[PDB]
Write a protein that binds this ligand. Structure first.
Ligand SMILES: *[C@@H]1O[C@H](CO)[C@@H](O[C@@H]2O[C@H](CO)[C@@H](O)[C@H](O)[C@H]2NC(C)=O)[C@H](O)[C@H]1NC(C)=O
Ligand SMILES: *[C@@H]1O[C@H](CO)[C@@H](O[C@@H]2O[C@H](CO)[C@@H](O)[C@H](O)[C@H]2NC(C)=O)[C@H](O)[C@H]1NC(C)=O
Ligand SMILES: *[C@@H]1O[C@H](CO)[C@@H](O[C@@H]2O[C@H](CO)[C@@H](O)[C@H](O)[C@H]2NC(C)=O)[C@H](O)[C@H]1NC(C)=O
Ligand SMILES: *[C@@H]1O[C@H](CO)[C@@H](O[C@@H]2O[C@H](CO)[C@@H](O)[C@H](O)[C@H]2NC(C)=O)[C@H](O)[C@H]1NC(C)=O
Ligand SMILES: *[C@@H]1O[C@H](CO)[C@@H](O[C@@H]2O[C@H](CO)[C@@H](O)[C@H](O)[C@H]2NC(C)=O)[C@H](O)[C@H]1NC(C)=O
Ligand SMILES: *[C@@H]1O[C@H](CO)[C@@H](O[C@@H]2O[C@H](CO)[C@@H](O)[C@H](O)[C@H]2NC(C)=O)[C@H](O)[C@H]1NC(C)=O
Ligand SMILES: *[C@@H]1O[C@H](CO)[C@@H](O[C@@H]2O[C@H](CO)[C@@H](O)[C@H](O)[C@H]2NC(C)=O)[C@H](O)[C@H]1NC(C)=O
Ligand SMILES: *[C@H]1O[C@H](CO)[C@@H](O)[C@H](O)[C@H]1NC(C)=O
Ligand SMILES: *[C@H]1O[C@H](CO)[C@@H](O)[C@H](O)[C@H]1NC(C)=O
Ligand SMILES: *[C@H]1O[C@H](CO)[C@@H](O)[C@H](O)[C@H]1NC(C)=O
Ligand SMILES: *[C@H]1O[C@H](CO)[C@@H](O)[C@H](O)[C@H]1NC(C)=O
Ligand SMILES: [Ca+2]
Ligand SMILES: [Ca+2]
Ligand SMILES: [Ca+2]
Ligand SMILES: [Ca+2]
Lengths: 444, 444, 444, 444
């Protein structure tokens, strides 16, 4: 179990609104990395997922032997203090799922006594998945600290003949009230109930108006069209949550809960968080709006089962991501787009602490500082409109990809540490080196 | 425990003399590295030690937060096959000794149910250790797989007032007949019994004559002087073995067994191996002879206690190491030298299988292919006089340091794999990145 | 162990009713304090707990680095005579629980061979604890004189879903018939069995009638309402006792025994005492009645387990405490109040020695002599209606807070000494300086 | 024993000459004080002595019940890290020597397994001691951690009829090569061998010339006269060292070793230190030169017994002390003086590391910043000519007295902490409150 110094400093808003204004990033600190490196120049390690809870943490990433176009590495352990005062992620178990099953886009989550991981089995190019009317096989693997492993092929209702494809968001899932929730996304088939119930719905971030040159009627029209991709088999690209009861005999008990397209952007990879008793969702900006999308999620239970989800966006115009064409970091107008990168963000302040939800919110993470290239990885702290602290890693031109950020407090020294897991392009070993950067978020 | 595919393919001579002639190195294979990386540009990870036995493996290295001038990372696990057929070193436990005790030059060894590690506590520059008449504190830490940890300060007899300094060789120790043996080295004080019993002794490798331009009388004179260093407090630089009975209450039961200077070169870092029931020793070439030094060690027991050791050198003139001044890779004449690098080698063939010990021996490892710089890491297979297979890693100029090689056979596919643990200079994260390269040693 | 001069003079009523009338306080005596001071102007040391038994004493207090809004200091030792004749509390062991766990409101008790301490883990403002339906984590730490330490998270039955919060009373617990008893208090949830069984119950001290201007029917109505706080999450503020069997593997064996609200006032901090074989309870006056509340407790065992407690109040109208608003030291009428200070009192005379329980009782302690401010610390001796001896410490305006009093007799010189542990506001080092004042209670 | 984080960071020069230039004092940190407070307004606690060694620390001070014109408190324990990273001096044993023997001016020293304390028995005003030809009784008490206590009255040779008085310097003694060394001082009788061998000797600090307005011949004449006090019975006020072999049956084995008056100023209180294998001495400036006096001491052994001592002064003109009349902090000219205060200093840099001994030395401690009053306690870091960092404690006018400073490094976090034990005048409890201030000495 995690050291006494951390058990009470996990999954919470660490600073008050007032303190958020005076936060700065400290130096990067050196700890033994718990994320394995490739041993060949061409080896590819990508798509990390990290979940940290009161008792322990779970980590996983995909490994491809030659180039990035597989096996899945899983790790679990605890956090303990070093003589220098900062954390050391102590690995207590390692697993390497290598058996011919092409598990991809995996999301992992901590569960009592272990880790639960959700993946889909890839057997063809992603685009092909959207055209085929049949969805890929879905699997959830439970790995207990006692070395028992139980993998199950799941068939949640409302998937067959509704979703042409379904993928985990790769971002971490969370254990909530006895259920394990994972972010999901995919393409929905035209004419289905889901498609019809979503017809004419769209979402436009609160701060777009002041930045978009188009008029309200034009924005609305374009936003509605941003949820359908002709390139991806003419499907409605949908975001949602997969709720699975913690059981070892899962078959069709997991539930697919899509977000209303009136509250969320075009479906994309994502991540789920827990701040106190509240669930939050991060949605990759793979559509027209290039800014960090975070939402407070309200989950409704009907007869002990998740029945519906509602999302409330934390309005911002900060931390853009690189994109292609008319959907770069400089875009501000609605339209159909299918480009971007995963770059989640951690809320250091409570958005509900303000009279108007998210009026003044502070968050931290990493982002690729450039308009269209996956370059210049930069760790930062920002509020709704400005970056109040940042530090680029490496020299300009340094290639990078996804970034997963997680923060926690050591209740002993009373300092907050954040880990920024970044896929870095390496010239020595492997295509990428996934690095768990760690530093302190200093108040002052 | 290690998978059934490896339990019977460890610590043995894998090929016959005839087969050794047709061995070649296969491609480097990509597996998730079990050696942790640094998370800052200046973080320094160095001095690895690796021990692999029938049941499991132990690994460790030193971590310094800023630059390479500390904490000690320890790891243990097993080996299991991947769907591609090659090994995956599965970590089952990690430890990070971080408590203010500056444990250095650590050597680790597998023991039933865990790992036993031997280190010395550094409190001043190495050179200062040789001048002070008092030796540094010596410690042996036993780490059981059940998480029990027992560290002891040891005071073996014949150390105080005999050795000005004593260090583990950093290379792996071995578990032999109930005792854990570690390679050691240091400086002996003038006028001591050890010094007197070693007076006038010297060793000249069998193949030096044909390569050295000096006459026999001159070589002998210079060789005798190569065991005394005026730079290192005027001490006799001695190599030896530390034998410790496997106990949890060690105090003064461990025994210091020095090698006779008539059979070994000037003391240096080293490593111990087990090939069947035979113990072998690798001695770093930190003196005048720049070639790989391997010896078969004969251990004598008197009353259940190791009482003396004898070494028989495997005569070679292959695989040189970079050195400074008149002691570079091109040197062949005896004289005092104190320069070199650690680069052990694994014997793929049995030296005793030939009528004349080591007349035709084959070994593999890595070496820095250059005369004086620690550059051009190159993995190879060689016999007594030639390199019969090799492959440089990276582009010329690539900096590197130590290299620890370990080979084992998968008795299922019947192929031999060797892991080359190499300290590589990295430009991205940390001063060095210790990489566990792995490939196959192919017969044909 | 305590010196022979004290082993037989602990936890007893030292004077007869007749002698109690002629008791006066002697000068304060100077002994080396056994309570550590802060080393910074802002350091905060508060909330002491002190337990003294036949063999030894246990002491503890909370330490907060900046201001009083943590770590827990623990100390244990014995009492021995000085050449001047008075006591010296000799510390034989010190401990500083500093590990990130925010242990608060701790109560300590002597146990054979050590100390047992009970705390709760605070993670949010106190008021928040009452609103959340989940109670804070509860912990009991046993610290043996042999340096073994065993901490356990306890989950006594009848706490979850009954008590929104639960805290130790901070006053000392006592070792009784193999069980360690601690005073407790907190908020009970509406609709629970406890709440229902307590419905319509109330307690009005025997001497209130003659001092209250309201009529009997009005007093009764207001008293009933004094047990419910809308400010503290609409909970019934309850007082009680936590009984824990002396074991090192405690989980759910400790028992929560609430006092009947027909015999005790609104729940508050408290302390348990032992006078001979009788258990006594002190209840902080945090409600409407501002006078010292002491009760003789009768404990019932069913099958070797504490099953119920009954309290009999020692009727007084002496020694008031400062309070806010209509609940100051001058208040005498029932109503809802949530203000006051901890100020226990030691009974120098046996309340049962009189035909009518407590008809003539004498006690000693400290109290803040003022109506609404925590000012003017004053040590005293008093009977049911008057203060018969007193001495203010410092000059008027001197700030102070809690006061823990403990008396014992030196059977050698035959004199009674009392220690008054008082939190004093200091201008030099720290926010408060907890001082163990000591003097004699003279007969004459 | 001390935590692993400190065992290797004690009694050493922590910084290089270059680093000494960039040292600053950090904030004062709050830890539970290990020095007991008085419990009455008039209680007097004074004259602390503190010794810290690899394994543990020893502490002691004098306690007088009424005013400062007795009993002796002794404490011993270890150092361990807190969750905030800084030290906590954990007391493991306390003792209170209270038995009618007036032990004064005690100096304490750590010894293997305990503490050895040296005191003299006062029976009359100090001045009377100098006039009486008979010296006061001398005692050394050994207190082992196992609670065994052995006190002995000692009669070292060369004391009777030579020294009219003899006192420990109150500063800590040190354990050196099997002997416990304590600083001493007193008055020598006219006509004795010591007096004759010291006749015409004098010492003038290297930096006095440039600051003194008198000529060389006048300075020399006045300096010679500064070693004789007509006020103190016309004795030669001498400084020295008392060497005692670590034995439990001491009688006349301890040796009185006086310093040559050609290398040291008029006798005064003092302290002994150990930096590596070197012994250093601090001499209170109770004579004409008001600046910090530190000397490297060379001890000569003849037949296993200390036979002579030699002192080499570290030349400075920094950190003056308050004095009376023509001997205030502003004085610079030789002459007879008998005024000053104890204020030792710790060397953060090695004086021998410079080509010219002490040419650039850095030290830290506390000093009363004023010309003639014991006021304005101020902690500082200084070099030979300037104070490069300082912070006054309290508001101007704050009375204080002695200051004992001790520094050590936590080899885990790699930071240096210094404890400044200062006698502070308090208005609340006791005449003085001896406070163990602690902070970090930051490099940068
Ligand atoms: C490892 O821990 C898991 C989690 O408890 C154990 O799982 C139990 O498995 C049995 C069937 O094999 C179920 O009936 C239980 O309900 C499971 N426990 C629950 C509720 O999670 C697993 O058995 C453990 N490994 C072993 C066999 O030691
Ligand atoms: C985000 O942070 C920025 C920078 O701190 C805030 O901008 C400052 O706003 C204050 C007004 O309260 C001005 O006094 C400063 O001059 C602004 N800084 C500058 C120069 O840009 C910004 O208001 C924050 N956004 C919010 C309100 O969340
Ligand atoms: C080491 O390997 C080399 C290369 O295989 C051996 O050299 C060969 O020796 C044979 C004689 O048996 C010749 O026919 C080849 O022409 C040699 N190779 C060349 C061209 O260098 C060498 O003999 C081996 N060393 C030993 C005997 O251990
Ligand atoms: C310190 O004293 C305690 C109190 O006796 C010892 O506790 C015992 O612990 C063992 C398990 O470790 C139990 O089985 C015993 O019942 C305990 N004794 C009882 C009844 O209190 C503790 O072991 C002592 N410390 C040591 C190990 O020397
Ligand atoms: C508490 O103590 C007071 C003071 O000693 C008692 O009051 C005295 O009562 C006696 C009657 O027995 C009178 O003779 C005195 O004049 C009273 N003292 C004064 C002047 O106040 C009081 O009775 C005691 N309370 C009890 C009975 O416990
Ligand atoms: C506490 O420790 C001291 C230190 O070892 C013990 O002292 C020994 O006392 C005996 C006589 O009583 C001597 O003969 C030994 O030489 C002493 N030891 C030495 C060399 O220091 C002391 O006895 C211990 N306390 C006990 C009795 O347990
Ligand atoms: C003690 O410290 C002072 C302050 O750092 C030193 O004075 C400085 O000396 C340098 C020359 O190397 C000048 O450049 C600075 O201007 C001086 N500081 C000032 C303005 O006073 C002083 O030299 C040090 N004393 C020594 C040499 O030990
Ligand atoms: C943060 O720093 C600013 C600038 O000094 C200060 O005014 C503010 O009070 C700080 N915020 C808080 C309340 O911690
Ligand atoms: C190795 O290869 C050579 C060349 O083909 C062959 O002649 C030889 O028999 C082989 N060695 C053995 C016996 O495996
Ligand atoms: C206490 O003092 C009173 C007044 O002198 C005296 O009458 C009484 O007897 C004393 N009490 C006892 C019995 O000790
Ligand atoms: C100390 O700080 C000064 C000023 O920045 C810098 O020049 C110097 O190198 C530092 N000293 C060292 C070597 O640590
Ligand atoms: Ca499909
Ligand atoms: Ca040495
Ligand atoms: Ca609650
Ligand atoms: Ca005298």
């Amino acid at each position: 179990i995690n050291d006494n110094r951390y058990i009470n400093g996990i999954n919470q808003f660490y600073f008050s609104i007032a303190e958020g204004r005076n936060l700065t990033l400290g130096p990067l600190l050196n700890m033994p990395s718990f994320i394995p490196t490739a041993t060949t120049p061409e080896g590819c390690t990508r798509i990390p997922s990290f979940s940290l809870t009161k008792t322990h943490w779970c980590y996983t990433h995909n490994v491809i032997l030659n180039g990035c176009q597989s096996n899945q590495f899983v790790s679990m352990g605890i956090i303990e203090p070093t003589s220098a005062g900062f954390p050391f992620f102590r690995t207590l178990k390692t697993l390497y799922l290598s058996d011919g099953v092409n598990r991809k886009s995996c999301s992992i989550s901590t569960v009592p006594g272990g880790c639960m991981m959700y993946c889909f089995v890839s057997t063809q190019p992603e685009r092909d998945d959207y055209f085929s009317a049949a969805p890929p096989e879905q699997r959830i693997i439970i790995m207990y600290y006692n070395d028992t492993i139980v993998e199950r092929i799941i068939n949640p209702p409302g998937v067959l003949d509704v979703w042409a494809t379904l993928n985990p968001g790769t971002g971490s899932g969370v254990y909530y009230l006895g259920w394990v929730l994972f972010p999901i996304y995919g393409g929905v088939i035209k004419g289905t109930s889901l498609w019809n119930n979503q017809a004419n719905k769209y979402f436009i971030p609160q701060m777009v108006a002041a930045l978009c040159s188009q008029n309200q009627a034009t924005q609305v029209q374009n936003a509605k069209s941003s949820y359908y991709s002709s390139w991806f088999g003419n499907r409605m690209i949908q975001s949602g949550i997969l709720a699975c009861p913690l059981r070892q005999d899962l078959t069709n008990e997991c539930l697919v809960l899509p977000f209303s397209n009136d509250q969320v952007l075009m479906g994309a990879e994502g991540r789920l968080y827990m701040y106190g008793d509240s669930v939050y969702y991060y949605q990759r900006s793979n559509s027209w709006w290039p800014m960090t999308m975070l939402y407070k999620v309200t989950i409704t239970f009907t007869n002990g089962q998740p029945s519906a989800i509602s999302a409330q966006n934390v309005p911002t115009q900060q931390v853009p991501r690189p994109g292609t064409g008319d959907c770069s970091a400089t875009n501000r107008c609605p339209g159909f787009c299918l480009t971007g990168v995963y770059a989640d963000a951690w809320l250091l302040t409570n958005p509900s602490s303000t009279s108007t939800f998210g009026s003044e919110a502070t968050f931290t993470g990493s982002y690729l500082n450039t308009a269209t290239q996956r370059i210049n990885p930069t760790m930062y702290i920002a509020n709704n409109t400005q970056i109040i602290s940042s530090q680029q890693f490496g020299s300009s031109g340094q290639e990078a990809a996804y970034g997963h950020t997680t923060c926690f407090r050591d209740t002993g020294s009373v300092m907050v540490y954040c880990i920024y897991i970044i896929e870095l392009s390496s010239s020595l070993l492997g295509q990428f080196q996934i690095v768990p950067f760690i530093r302190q978020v200093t108040l002052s």
